[PDB]
């Protein structure tokens, strides 16, 4: 998504180390 | 900037068909018969045209017009006997083609094999009608005998005969009807042959070894065009020997007599390329059973791909199946010989034995042999 606003951009920063996850019937996720 | 060979639509189709088509390297001579069929077809389409250009279709001028083509038309006899014996050449090539497809396990190409069976039926019907055309004694009486089989069909059967006869017996109506059908059918055969080549090209030819040869593939044009030219030369040698030296070798002399419905010839035999099946007809006293066996004798090729039980595809490495296949070929030859001879001792019992053995070999002996065969090779 394109972000061009403070409110939408809020929360897109990271404060915890990156954590990937893949499944068998669930799409890939990251945090 | 490109080859018009591989960019022009028609030229692209021709190129993919028989110029740059990947063909197996080790294709034996037995494959040449494929083209030897098509060439025959072309010849049969050619000469027949020049026959239909001097052939009437009325029963008062059928035989006379044929004699006119033979005696008066400039070089007409060449065309007439070229047609008559090119039919036999066509059927020799057809039988050898079916034998090749059977031996090397080419029936695994299901679509091409089924289309081939359809082509076989169409060619046999066309040849039957063509032999009816000259209105000889053999012509008329064989037509009556063959069409009267359809009376055995339950219920509709009788009506069907009166439908095809266009009346009550093979007569004026049936002659012209068979002329029209014999004219139209070969073009249907050509269309089916084109479809057949399409289906075969979707997978590629099968080599004698029966194994996929995608690694050793060679272009068709520089090699197999000249191989096919040599095959056509040999077939022309045989056909021209037949026509020029002994034209009435494969025919029957009684066919040179005007058709007289009030008297029959001493023997009523069909053309040679049909006797193998006619004998089967004569095997079963039950007329309906006879007709059913007659149809099944050809329709068995449809079931043949299903019955394949051997792990290997071809017969190159199956000696037991090789002896079985040659038993089958000898059986077909025996049926052909039996068909000619009259219904007398010992031809009756020999005919029953041959007819039984044919289906026994195709349906039972071959699959069981393949089952023993795999067991003999750890699989």
């Amino acid at each position: 998504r394109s972000f061009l606003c403070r409110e939408s951009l809020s929360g897109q920063a990271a404060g915890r180390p990156l954590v990937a996850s893949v499944g068998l019937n669930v799409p890939a996720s990251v945090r | 900037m490109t080859n018009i060979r591989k960019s022009h639509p028609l030229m692209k189709i021709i190129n993919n068909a028989f110029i740059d088509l990947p063909a197996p390297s080790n294709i034996s001579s037995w494959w040449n018969f494929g083209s030897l069929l098509g060439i025959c077809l072309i010849l049969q389409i050619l000469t027949g045209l020049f026959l239909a250009m001097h052939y009437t279709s009325d029963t008062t001028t059928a035989f006379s017009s044929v004699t006119h083509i033979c005696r008066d038309v400039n070089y007409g006899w060449v065309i007439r006997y070229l047609h008559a014996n090119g039919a036999s050449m066509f059927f020799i090539c057809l039988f050898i083609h079916v034998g090749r497809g059977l031996y090397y396990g080419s029936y695994m190409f299901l679509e091409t094999w089924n289309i081939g069976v359809v082509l076989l039926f169409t060619v046999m019907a066309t040849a039957f009608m063509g032999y009816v055309l000259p209105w000889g004694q053999m012509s008329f009486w064989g037509a009556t005998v063959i069409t009267n089989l359809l009376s055995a069909i339950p219920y509709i059967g009788t009506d069907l005969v009166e439908w095809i006869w266009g009346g009550f017996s093979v007569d004026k109506a049936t002659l012209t009807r068979f002329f029209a059908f014999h004219f139209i059918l070969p073009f249907i055969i050509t269309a089916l042959a084109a479809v057949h080549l399409l289906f075969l090209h979707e997978t590629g030819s099968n080599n004698p070894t029966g194994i996929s040869s995608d690694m050793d593939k060679i272009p068709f044009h520089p090699y197999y065009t000249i191989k096919d030219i040599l095959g056509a030369l040999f077939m022309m040698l045989i056909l021209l020997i037949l026509v020029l030296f002994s034209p009435d070798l494969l025919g029957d002399p009684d066919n040179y007599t005007p058709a007289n419905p009030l008297n029959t010839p001493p023997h009523i035999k069909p053309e040679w390329y049909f006797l193998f099946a006619y004998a089967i007809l004569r095997s079963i006293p039950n007329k309906l059973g006879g007709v059913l066996a007659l149809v099944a004798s050809i329709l068995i090729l449809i079931l043949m791909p299903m019955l394949h039980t051997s792990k290997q595809r071809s017969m190159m490495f199956r000696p037991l199946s090789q002896c079985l296949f040659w038993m089958l070929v000898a059986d077909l030859i025996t049926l052909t010989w039996i068909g000619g001879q009259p219904v007398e001792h010992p031809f009756i019992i020999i005919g029953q034995l041959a007819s039984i053995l044919y289906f026994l070999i195709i349906l039972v002996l071959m699959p069981i042999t393949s089952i023993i065969e795999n067991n003999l090779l750890k699989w």
């Binding site: - | 080790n26 194994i211 690694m215």
Partner: protein
Amino acid sequence: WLEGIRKWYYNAAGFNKLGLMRDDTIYEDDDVKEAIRRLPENLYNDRVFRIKRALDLTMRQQILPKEQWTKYEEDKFYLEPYLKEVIRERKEREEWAK
């Protein structure tokens, strides 16, 4: 005994004369094609070369000299495990679809 009959059959089959191994002569159905794809590279390369040499020999209608004939004892069984596994997987799929 039986193994003598099997050896006689291997001799009379003829694929040894072409340098072919048993598994090179098998018909390539879908299961066999997938098994061939599953083969390790080193086995696949030898399979392809053996097949191509055999096709060459049959094109020229010849056989290898008697010394270079795949002996019955030396006829390894490379495609058998992969084909067995493929058949097992297909059987499992069919049983689950049942």
